[PDB]
Amino acid sequence: ETLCGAELVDALQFVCGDRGFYFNKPTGYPQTGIVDECCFRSCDLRRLEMYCAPLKP
């Protein structure tokens, strides 16, 4: 539920596999990202999944 530090990174590695992840969602045209939603808060797998990089292949 709460995934912090290494455990967060493990989760993202596992869920995102080859794609990679990032920690802050992009914006645009006061920061915040996976830590906030998955570490300070429990988060679910679909939220976690949102910090997987685009595919592209």
The CATH number given to whatever domain includes residue 25 is 1.10.100.10
Beta bridge partners of 52: 21
Q: For residues 53 and 56, what is the distance between their CA atoms, to the nearest angstrom?
A: 9
How many Cβ atoms sit within 10 Å of the Cβ of residue 38?
24
Yes or no: say if 51 and 29 are a contact pair by the CB < 8 Å rule: no
Give the C-alpha separation, 30 to 49, whole Å.
Answer: 22
Domain extent, residue 39, equals: 1-57
- Report the distance separating Cα 1 and Cα 56, nearest Å: 29
- Looking at the 3D structure of the chain, how many domains does it have? 1
Q: Mind giving me the DSSP string for the chain?
A: ----HHHHHHHHHHHHGGG-B-SB--------BHIIIIIIS---HHHHHTTBPP---
Nearest to 24 by CA among 11, 15, 35: 35
Distance of CA 7 to the CA centre of its chain: 11
